[PDB]
Design a protein around this ligand. Structure first.
Ligand code: NA
Length: 129
């Protein structure tokens, strides 16, 4: 499922991401835009034989089982395909354990490179929230 900016903003707020670990909604929308283009089905092979899955491009090295990621961890205790659903519950709940682990949203390269230190409130501007 491909979300619009404000449609995902509202879905993410609905799932309790707004100021989760002090990260305002704009931060999550910005990350989602530059990670997946708001597409729950987005997959991208990483450098090391891992793959990134879903709206927040969660990585198989650490966070889920895709049955091809070397000597792998499943820290969110899901198959990576669960993250591609039109229902974003799995991606949101896993993202909460990622951002909580101590590095915050720096886990997302797109966030660190494109959202961090920018006017992230632009991302929810004109959105019914
Ligand atoms: Na894995």
């Amino acid at each position: 499922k491909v979300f619009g900016r404000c449609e995902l903003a509202a879905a993410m707020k609905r799932h309790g991401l707004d100021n989760y670990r002090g990260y305002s909604l704009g931060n999550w929308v910005c990350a989602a835009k530059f990670e997946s283009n708001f597409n729950t089905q987005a997959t991208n092979r990483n450098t090391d034989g891992s793959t990134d899955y879903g709206i927040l491009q969660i990585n198989s090295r650490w966070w889920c089982n895709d049955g091809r990621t070397p000597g792998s961890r499943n820290l969110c205790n899901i198959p990576c395909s669960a993250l591609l659903s039109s229902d974003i519950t799995a991606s949101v709940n896993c993202a909460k354990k990622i951002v909580s682990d101590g590095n915050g949203m720096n886990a997302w390269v797109a966030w660190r490179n494109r959202c961090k230190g920018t006017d992230v409130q632009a991302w929810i501007r004109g959105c019914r929230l």
